[PDB]
Amino acid sequence: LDKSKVINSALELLNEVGIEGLTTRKLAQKLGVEQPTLYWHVKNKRALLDALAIEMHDRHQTHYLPLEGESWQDFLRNFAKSMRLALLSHRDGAKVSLGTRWTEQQYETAENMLAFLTQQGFSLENALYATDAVRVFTLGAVLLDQEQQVAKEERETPTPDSMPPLLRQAWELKVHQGAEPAFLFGLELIIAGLEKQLKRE
Amino acid sequence: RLDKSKVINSALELLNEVGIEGLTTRKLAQKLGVEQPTLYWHVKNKRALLDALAIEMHDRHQTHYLPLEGESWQDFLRNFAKSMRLALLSHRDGAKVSLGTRWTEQQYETAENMLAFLTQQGFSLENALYATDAVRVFTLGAVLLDQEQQVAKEERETPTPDSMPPLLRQAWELKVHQGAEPAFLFGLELIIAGLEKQLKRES
């Protein structure tokens, strides 16, 4: 009947059945309680996903708050990288986090994040869209990689010899790129744009 | 007599009815009123179905894969991202349908001409490739988040703005009233400005 045991079991079930197979019914079953028992901790699948996402980001310490002396640039880098590693620590992590939003218990943290960026000279709007850009990019990079790896198993492999010369060279790079370098390339573009943006402002 | 276009039209309607998770070739054949081998000639499996749905969405909604005459690379990437976004938004789970795709052989000339264009404008082949991939990833991400949040919205209590701190309240107001397009355009402009900084560094 403990929140913590509910969440630990649910994380285990996530890894066993993935996000699409997860239900409150199967969690009640794995826990051995009557639906209304579970209901009081987790009212529906959506609330279960929301709780799972809070737990993942908490336990992997997604970097929501800047350290003293941390530049805004490094702060956004650390936020992205730590979020990414939190998402990659659980089956369908990115999918679980895709639908989340700040809970009331997180409003102080969220406010402090925006306060930090606006203290650097970003407008509220720009601080907001910066954080959102880093979030959606990070989600997109993880989700695209995951799905590309499934998809290439359900389709004939491409034939390199059929590729015209630039594309062939492109193909060869991407064979070797790795997920983390793709992610970091985009991340750095975003940070560099924000710097330019902050100067102009 | 079943034509490919009918398969695709009907599959796009079924996508809207049941979503990407619920879409199956069995349900499509039932919808078309045909036996399973008749459909199979057109789409061998669910992956082939998604591949063909993505191609149709991007074709119909005129995703900007080809630069205009005299178009700058900046305007090219803006138009690519924006048009791709609207294509993904045209159908339920549209971003998820495009998420697993890759160039087909029939698109290799398109993809070549895109790399030729970007290198002509002064990018290395490597940075031309990674630029396009970063814009694509950002655009998929934005629409993934938009479409999932649309569903999530109806499965939980709505927040209470009056209990929010000042800056977060201002943020909430912005997102509720301006919707997802300004946030998307902001991030796109960041990527373009980052790419300009990259050309300067490689000067």
Ligand SMILES: COc1nc(C)nc(NC(=O)NS(=O)(=O)c2ccccc2Cl)n1
């Ligand atoms: C940027 O990381 C992050 N993480 C979460 C969990 N949510 C958000 N943004 C968010 O929730 N935005 S919102 O528009 O849905 C919102 C909800 C409640 C209060 C304020 C706001 Cl802006 N970003």
Ligand SMILES: COc1nc(C)nc(NC(=O)NS(=O)(=O)c2ccccc2Cl)n1
């Ligand atoms: C940039 O928009 C876009 N659209 C599609 C459909 N695919 C891609 N990229 C892509 O397919 N990359 S790839 O590495 O899997 C590839 C496959 C075949 C030949 C070359 C390459 Cl690079 N981008």
